[PDB]
Every structure is written in structure tokens, then in C-alpha cells.
Design a protein around this nucleic acid. Structure first.
Ligand SMILES: [Ca+2]
Length: 314
DNA sequence: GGTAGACCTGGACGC
DNA sequence: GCGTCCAGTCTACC
């Protein structure tokens, strides 16, 4: 009853809602789509994970986003806590308003979007984002998800336990920069990315001015930020774009990888026109990125998530 | 400046 | 059941 992960039905008094139609947000399309790797649908239609340093379970009805927190007297979320949820889902950004625009300038987007409404961008913490995506390179979303989990259990702060799941906060820079972390990460299966994590943790802390250097990018321009991020080991233009798009409030950032190339070719008959090569390459990927920005506008990154997330769904 | 290849790991095809 | 194939960054090099 008071044990295990909650359900809307099971413990009514402990939930609270946030006005939010499914047209504006589809948890099933956002939480497992490779933006964040830390949410799990423990019970059907119920997603649990760490948000704002606490564990939550989220679920929705047609017009409401129901939320619950596990902090010590169990009680429904407070308006201030719920605000953290709205901020995490950037709910002040109107999706219907963005879909309309993208749809009006791109017939193909219009066609596809009709079936995949409610795909928006989560506003993520820079550190988790940086290291989660450092783990994403040349890898599949399933292994990635396993790596990040193991990473947080071994190095992140212990939160609360539900059923047989012990939740952990994402590791701090100090923890990731620690001694023998690389060796430990290799035993956890991160492969060669084990060194990237260790090396980037130290680089940020011992050469770039620490957490402040990263946190200050949310005020810098996309061009600056993206360039700054690329210095870090394991962080290329692609990983840097994901971070810019998902953590540094750069909605125009467009991560170009295999999915996007196939979409460009199949749905837009796109070809590199100024680039040297015909296939993927540093030059062509950059060009592809510009094509989508020019096509979708300032929130091209978000538009990208709609088609991307819809691609995984096939 | 702009290519080729190697690359940890493990669920998937291919056969 | 085995070998090969896939899900970005980095580096040696022409
Ligand atoms: Ca690939």
C-alpha cells in the first residue's frame, strides 16, 4: 500500500495534477526517446525517475499531468515542487503553437506531426546531459540506458528505494573526476567512453573553471557554447549539439546523426550542395544542420525531436 | 583541410 | 548456434 512505486489508482490522496493536455505532452513519446535515459515505466503508463533531486512518478489523463513525489510524512507535491515539473517539461512553451508554424512551412512535417503530437524537449541539468551523451556516441539507446544507470548507482548520491529499485542522483563532477574512476567505469561496461567521462570531469574541474564554466553557457550564444563544449574529450559537434539543445537552452541546435541523414534523404530528397563529400562527414553534417535550421527556424532542434522521436517509432 | 579506420559492448540479423 | 552488423569521436595521414 504505502510500499512500492505509486499508481494514480492505488494512492489518490498522494497525487496532484498540472493542467496539461496530451496534445501538449506525451510522456510515452518524450521520456524514452533518447533525451533523458533515466526514466522507467515501472507500472503501465507510470514513469518514475529523479527530477530536481527527488524521485517522482508521472502519469497522465487526457487533460492532466498527474505527479507524485517521494521525499518524511508522505504527502502530495507542493505547488513549488510541481513548478519544478513544469520547468522540467518547459510547459510555458506552447507546442501547438510550434507545430502550427513548423507544419505551415513544411508539408512533410505537417503530415507526420498529426500522429505524433506532444513531443517536446526536456530542460535538463548540464552535468547529467554532458556525461549521459558522452556515453551516447557510437552506441544504441538500450546499452546507453544500462551504462548511465550503472554509472549513477556506483557514483551518484543514494536517494530512496521503491520496491527493489534504489534511486540515485546523477554523479557530481568531483565524483566523476575521482581516482581510478576510469577503471571502475570499464568494469561497468562503458568501453572506451570510460576514459572520456574521467577525462572530461577533470578537464572541466582542472582547466575550465569548474561547474561555473558549464553553467555559464546557458547565458552564452549557441556558437560559443557549442565551440566550448567540443574541447571536452568524447564531445564532438553531435554530442555538443544534444547538450546545447537539451541543457543549454539552445532550441535551434540540431543534432545530426544517422537518423537525421536517413530522414533528410528519404523525406526531403536532400543532398549536400556545398560540401565536398556526398555522404556523412564533418562538412556535410554541418550543412545538414543548417538546412534544418533554415527550414524550421529558431526551434529547429525541437522540430527535429518530433521527426526523430517519430522515427524510432518505426 | 578533408578523408579512412579503429573502436567497447551486446542485442540483432543473416544464413 | 557463430560471424557480421549497428547503434560518433578521435587520430593518423595524404
Ligand atoms: Ca554509425
Amino acid at each position: 500500500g504505502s510500499e512500492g512505486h505509486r499508481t494514480l489508482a492505488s494512492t489518490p490522496a498522494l497525487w496532484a495534477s498540472i493542467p496539461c493536455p496530451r496534445s501538449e505532452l506525451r510522456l510515452d513519446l518524450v521520456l524514452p526517446s533518447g533525451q533523458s535515459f533515466r526514466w522507467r515505466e515501472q507500472s503501465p503508463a507510470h514513469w518514475s525517475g529523479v527530477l530536481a533531486d527527488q524521485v517522482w512518478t508521472l502519469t497522465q489523463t487526457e487533460e492532466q499531468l498527474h505527479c507524485t513525489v517521494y521525499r518524511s510524512q508522505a504527502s502530495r507535491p507542493t505547488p513549488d515542487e510541481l513548478e519544478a515539473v513544469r520547468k522540467y517539461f518547459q510547459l510555458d512553451v506552447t507546442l501547438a503553437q510550434l507545430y502550427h508554424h513548423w507544419g505551415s512551412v513544411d508539408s512533410h512535417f505537417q503530415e507526420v506531426a498529426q500522429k505524433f503530437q506532444g513531443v517536446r524537449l526536456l530542460r535538463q541539468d548540464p552535468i547529467e546531459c554532458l556525461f549521459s551523451f558522452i556515453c551516447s556516441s557510437n552506441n544504441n539507446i538500450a546499452r546507453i540506458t544500462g551504462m548511465v544507470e550503472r554509472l549513477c548507482q556506483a557514483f551518484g548520491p543514494r536517494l530512496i528505494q521503491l520496491d527493489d529499485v534504489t534511486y540515485h542522483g546523477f554523479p557530481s563532477l568531483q565524483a566523476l573526476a575521482g581516482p581510478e574512476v576510469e577503471a571502475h567505469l570499464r568494469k561497468l561496461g562503458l568501453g572506451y567512453r570510460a576514459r572520456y567521462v574521467s577525462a572530461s570531469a577533470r578537464a572541466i574541474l582542472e582547466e575550465q573553471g569548474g561547474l561555473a564554466w558549464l553553467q555559464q553557457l546557458r547565458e552564452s550564444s549557441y556558437e560559443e557554447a557549442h565551440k566550448a563544449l567540443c574541447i571536452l574529450p568524447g564531445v564532438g559537434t553531435k554530442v555538443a549539439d544534444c547538450i546545447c539543445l537539451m541543457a543549454l537552452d539552445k532550441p535551434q541546435a540540431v543534432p545530426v546523426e544517422v537518423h537525421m541523414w536517413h530522414i533528410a534523404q528519404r523525406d526531403y530528397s536532400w543532398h549536400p550542395t556545398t560540401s565536398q563529400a556526398k555522404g556523412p562527414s564533418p562538412q556535410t553534417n554541418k550543412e545538414l544542420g543548417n538546412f534544418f535550421r533554415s527550414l524550421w527556424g529558431p526551434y529547429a532542434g525541437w522540430a527535429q525531436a518530433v521527426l526523430f522521436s517519430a522515427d524510432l517509432r518505426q
